[PDB]
Amino acid sequence: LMSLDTALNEMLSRVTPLTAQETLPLVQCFGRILASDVVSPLDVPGFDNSAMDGYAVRLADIASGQPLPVAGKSFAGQPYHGEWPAGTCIRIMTGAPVPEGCEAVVMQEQTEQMDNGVRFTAEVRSGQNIRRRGEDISAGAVVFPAGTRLTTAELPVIASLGIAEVPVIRKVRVALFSTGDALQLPGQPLGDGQIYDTNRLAVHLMLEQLGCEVINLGIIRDDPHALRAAFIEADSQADVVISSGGVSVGEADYTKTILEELGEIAFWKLAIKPGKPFAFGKLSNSWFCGLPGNPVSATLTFYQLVQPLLAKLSGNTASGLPARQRVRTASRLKKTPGRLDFQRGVLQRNADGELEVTTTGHQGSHIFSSFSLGNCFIVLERDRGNVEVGEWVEVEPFNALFG
Amino acid sequence: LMSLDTALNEMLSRVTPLTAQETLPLVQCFGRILASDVVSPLDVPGFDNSAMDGYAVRLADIASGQPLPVAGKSFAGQPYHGEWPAGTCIRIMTGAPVPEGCEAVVMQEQTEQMDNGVRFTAEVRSGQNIRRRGEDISAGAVVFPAGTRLTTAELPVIASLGIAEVPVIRKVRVALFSTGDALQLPGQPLGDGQIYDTNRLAVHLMLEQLGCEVINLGIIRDDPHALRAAFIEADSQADVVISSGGVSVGEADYTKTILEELGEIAFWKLAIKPGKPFAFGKLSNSWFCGLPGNPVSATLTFYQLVQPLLAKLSGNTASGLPARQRVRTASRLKKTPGRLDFQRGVLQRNADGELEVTTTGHQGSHIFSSFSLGNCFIVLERDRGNVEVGEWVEVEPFNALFG
Structure with a gap:
C-alpha cells in the first residue's frame, strides 16, 4: 500500500542529523563527516613554480638572440637565490620555485645546448609555464564544506594545507538485537522448530562497513522483562535501535504490545518485493527500525530503508545510496x-x-x-x-x- | 614505452598468494579471503517442501476429476505425520513438508473449493511446485570455494549452515614511507620551497580501506643511512613496501643506488597518463612499489597497479579492479x-x-x-x-x- 518513497520520506523528515563532534587526525577520518567547513590557511600553489623541466628566462635576454649560460638552478626543495646576471638563464625543474624576476619558462625540448650558452628554438610567450601562486586554492577560501564525507579524494587535499586534524560528526550509534526462543547461535543444537539467527550477522556486518558504532545485544529470549530490558538499554546508548528479527512488525503478539508501550511505533505494509512489513518509530531517546524475519526481506529493507536513515543522521549532506x-x-x-x-x-x-x-x-x-x-x-x-x-x-x- | 597491460602481467606473474591463515568468527570476516572451501554440514532444504500455498495431491485422486476434501494441513512449522485418506487432498503452505507420497502441489489460486470438496483445473503436472531436499545446497557440497572474498552476500549463508567461524588468509602487510628534505609534516612551518607530504596519507587511507595492515614509517630524512635502515625495517615487517614519494623511480641519485643495492628493482616507463615512471621489484623478504612523486600520478599508479597486486597477494581468486x-x-x-x-x-x-x-x-x-x-x-x-x-x-x- 504505502509506497517506498512515501515511507522513505516520512522517515527522513522526522530525523535531525547528529551534531556532536570530535577532532581526529586525517588518517582516522575515512568515511567521516566534516563538522565545519575546511578553510584553507594558505595559497596553493604557495609560490610561482615551474610547470615543466627546463629553464627560467627573461624576455629581453631571449630577444638578445644570443645563447644563455646557466647561472644556477632551482630544484624541488632547493630554490635558486643567486645573482642571475643579464644574458644568463636558470635551469629549473617541475614544481620548483621560479626565480625572482622570471618572466617565462621554456621546456627542454625547445632548447639546444652550446658551449657559450643555451639557445631557445621556439617562441617565448610572457608568463608561459609559470603556475601562479594561489591559482588553485587561495588562503581564506572554503575548500570543503561541512557535511562532506571525507575520502581519499579530500583528506589528501586537506593535508596539502598543513592541517593535521579536522572536526567531524561523531559516529552514529546503532543498537542491534534479535529475539525468539526458536533462534539459536550458529554452532549450537538446532532444536525442533528452531533456526540459526542469521539476520543479526547480516545487519552487524553492514552497520560496521557503513561506519557505525555497533552495540550488539545478541539474541533475547521470549520473556517480557528481558525484552523490555534490552530496549531501555539500547535506547539509552544508541541513536538508532534495530530489531534484526523476532520482534513484531505488525502481527499480534506480546512483542508488539511491548513495542507499543515503549514508544510511538508505526507498523507499515510497503508496496515492495521482497518484503512488505516494516516497523518505524520514536523511542524515548532513539529511533527504532524493525525488520521482517525472512533473510532476503530484512536485508533488502535494511539496504533501501535503514541505510538512507543512517546516512542523514550522520551529517552527510549528500544522498546516501547508489x-x-x-x-x-x-x-x-x-x-x-x-x-x-x-x-x-x-x-x-x-x-x-x-x-x-x-x-x-x-x-x-x-x-x-x-x-x-x-x-x-x-x-x-x-x-x-x-x-x-x-x-x-x-x-x-x-x-x-x-x- | 611499456604498456599498462604488459606491466600488470609482469607484476602479477611474479607474485605468489599468501597462504598463512587464521580462523575467525563470521562477524570479523568482511572483505577477508577464505583459506579453504566451506563445505556444507547439511541439506538445504532439509526435506521436500511445498513451493506454494495450495494443496498437496496424488495424481490418482486428481484423475477422478471429482471433489477432493481437505483431509488435513501441513504447515511450515509442523508437518503432517498423520494420514492421507485416499481420494483426498492436503492443504499445504509454502516451505511446509510435503506429505508422504505427495506427487504434486497445486496453487490454491487455481482451485475453486465447493462446499463438499476441492476441485482442480490446470492439469496437475507431476512433481510441480515441490522443493526437494538439497535442491539449493546438497550436504557435502562446496558452498563457497577457497579464494572467495567474504561479504554480506556470503557470510550470512555460512551462518545459516550452523558454522560460527572460518579459516581465512591472514591480512596482507604493507610498509609505507616517503622521503625528501622538501617535505614537511602537516603541522609545522613550510621552509623555502617546501610542501606538505600528502602521498603517504593517500596511500595509507587506501591501504586500510583495502584491508591491509599498514606500517607507516613516516618521512625518512634525506640521508643514505636513514633510507637504508628504513628499507631494512620495512622489508622485515611487510609483504609489500611502498615508497609514496622521494625514492627514485628512475632518476640517478643516492636513493636509486640504495634501491639497486638492497634488491632486484626494475624501473619502468609506462605508456599511461597521468604518471609514467614506476619502480618495482623484489627485496629480501618483500615486494617493493615505488610511486612517482606527483600526487595524481601516485594515486593513479597505486590504484591501477598496486591495488591489483594486493588483491592477488591476499589469496583472492577474482579480478580486483572495477x-x-x-x-x-x-x-x-x-x-x-x-x-x-x-x-x-x-x-x-x-x-x-x-x-x-x-x-x-x-x-x-x-x-x-x-x-x-x-x-x-x-x-x-x-x-x-x-x-x-x-x-x-x-x-x-x-x-x-x-x-
Whole structure:
C-alpha cells in the first residue's frame, strides 16, 4: 500500500542529523563527516613554480638572440637565490620555485645546448609555464564544506594545507538485537522448530562497513522483562535501535504490545518485493527500525530503508545510496503489478560493449544466493507487469556491502 | 614505452598468494579471503517442501476429476505425520513438508473449493511446485570455494549452515614511507620551497580501506643511512613496501643506488597518463612499489597497479579492479596519441535516463581536485587523439576509495 518513497520520506523528515563532534587526525577520518567547513590557511600553489623541466628566462635576454649560460638552478626543495646576471638563464625543474624576476619558462625540448650558452628554438610567450601562486586554492577560501564525507579524494587535499586534524560528526550509534526462543547461535543444537539467527550477522556486518558504532545485544529470549530490558538499554546508548528479527512488525503478539508501550511505533505494509512489513518509530531517546524475519526481506529493507536513515543522521549532506541507470534486459522478468520489485540481476558487457542485465535466476525469498550471484538490483516499477527481453529497465548496482 | 597491460602481467606473474591463515568468527570476516572451501554440514532444504500455498495431491485422486476434501494441513512449522485418506487432498503452505507420497502441489489460486470438496483445473503436472531436499545446497557440497572474498552476500549463508567461524588468509602487510628534505609534516612551518607530504596519507587511507595492515614509517630524512635502515625495517615487517614519494623511480641519485643495492628493482616507463615512471621489484623478504612523486600520478599508479597486486597477494581468486562500460561523452576531450589516458569525469543520467560522461575540468596532474569532482575514469585508448561530443568512450567508475 504505502509506497517506498512515501515511507522513505516520512522517515527522513522526522530525523535531525547528529551534531556532536570530535577532532581526529586525517588518517582516522575515512568515511567521516566534516563538522565545519575546511578553510584553507594558505595559497596553493604557495609560490610561482615551474610547470615543466627546463629553464627560467627573461624576455629581453631571449630577444638578445644570443645563447644563455646557466647561472644556477632551482630544484624541488632547493630554490635558486643567486645573482642571475643579464644574458644568463636558470635551469629549473617541475614544481620548483621560479626565480625572482622570471618572466617565462621554456621546456627542454625547445632548447639546444652550446658551449657559450643555451639557445631557445621556439617562441617565448610572457608568463608561459609559470603556475601562479594561489591559482588553485587561495588562503581564506572554503575548500570543503561541512557535511562532506571525507575520502581519499579530500583528506589528501586537506593535508596539502598543513592541517593535521579536522572536526567531524561523531559516529552514529546503532543498537542491534534479535529475539525468539526458536533462534539459536550458529554452532549450537538446532532444536525442533528452531533456526540459526542469521539476520543479526547480516545487519552487524553492514552497520560496521557503513561506519557505525555497533552495540550488539545478541539474541533475547521470549520473556517480557528481558525484552523490555534490552530496549531501555539500547535506547539509552544508541541513536538508532534495530530489531534484526523476532520482534513484531505488525502481527499480534506480546512483542508488539511491548513495542507499543515503549514508544510511538508505526507498523507499515510497503508496496515492495521482497518484503512488505516494516516497523518505524520514536523511542524515548532513539529511533527504532524493525525488520521482517525472512533473510532476503530484512536485508533488502535494511539496504533501501535503514541505510538512507543512517546516512542523514550522520551529517552527510549528500544522498546516501547508489544512483540508477537505464539498460536493456537479456532475460525475461516475471513481475506482478502492485508492488515495486527489487529483483536481483547481473550487469555485464554485451558484444557491442554496452551494459545489459540478466536475472540471477529464481527471485524467491527462500534462498539468499541472488545476492552473491548478481551485482545489482533491477528496480521494477510498481505498476509494471512482466518484462520482455529487449525492454528498457532501471538497474541499481550493488554497493560495497555486497562485494 | 611499456604498456599498462604488459606491466600488470609482469607484476602479477611474479607474485605468489599468501597462504598463512587464521580462523575467525563470521562477524570479523568482511572483505577477508577464505583459506579453504566451506563445505556444507547439511541439506538445504532439509526435506521436500511445498513451493506454494495450495494443496498437496496424488495424481490418482486428481484423475477422478471429482471433489477432493481437505483431509488435513501441513504447515511450515509442523508437518503432517498423520494420514492421507485416499481420494483426498492436503492443504499445504509454502516451505511446509510435503506429505508422504505427495506427487504434486497445486496453487490454491487455481482451485475453486465447493462446499463438499476441492476441485482442480490446470492439469496437475507431476512433481510441480515441490522443493526437494538439497535442491539449493546438497550436504557435502562446496558452498563457497577457497579464494572467495567474504561479504554480506556470503557470510550470512555460512551462518545459516550452523558454522560460527572460518579459516581465512591472514591480512596482507604493507610498509609505507616517503622521503625528501622538501617535505614537511602537516603541522609545522613550510621552509623555502617546501610542501606538505600528502602521498603517504593517500596511500595509507587506501591501504586500510583495502584491508591491509599498514606500517607507516613516516618521512625518512634525506640521508643514505636513514633510507637504508628504513628499507631494512620495512622489508622485515611487510609483504609489500611502498615508497609514496622521494625514492627514485628512475632518476640517478643516492636513493636509486640504495634501491639497486638492497634488491632486484626494475624501473619502468609506462605508456599511461597521468604518471609514467614506476619502480618495482623484489627485496629480501618483500615486494617493493615505488610511486612517482606527483600526487595524481601516485594515486593513479597505486590504484591501477598496486591495488591489483594486493588483491592477488591476499589469496583472492577474482579480478580486483572495477569494470568498464561504453558511454557517450557530453564533453570535448583533449587526448594525445602515444599514451593510455586515465582522465577523470562525471558519470550522470541524461534526460533519457541513460549515462553520459562530462569531464571534471582541467586534467593536469598539478591538481588533486579531479578525484573529488569526478566519479569515474574515462579510459581513452592509447592510440586515440582528441575526442568530440557524442563520441563513444570507455568509463571505469571509481570504487569505494574515492567516495
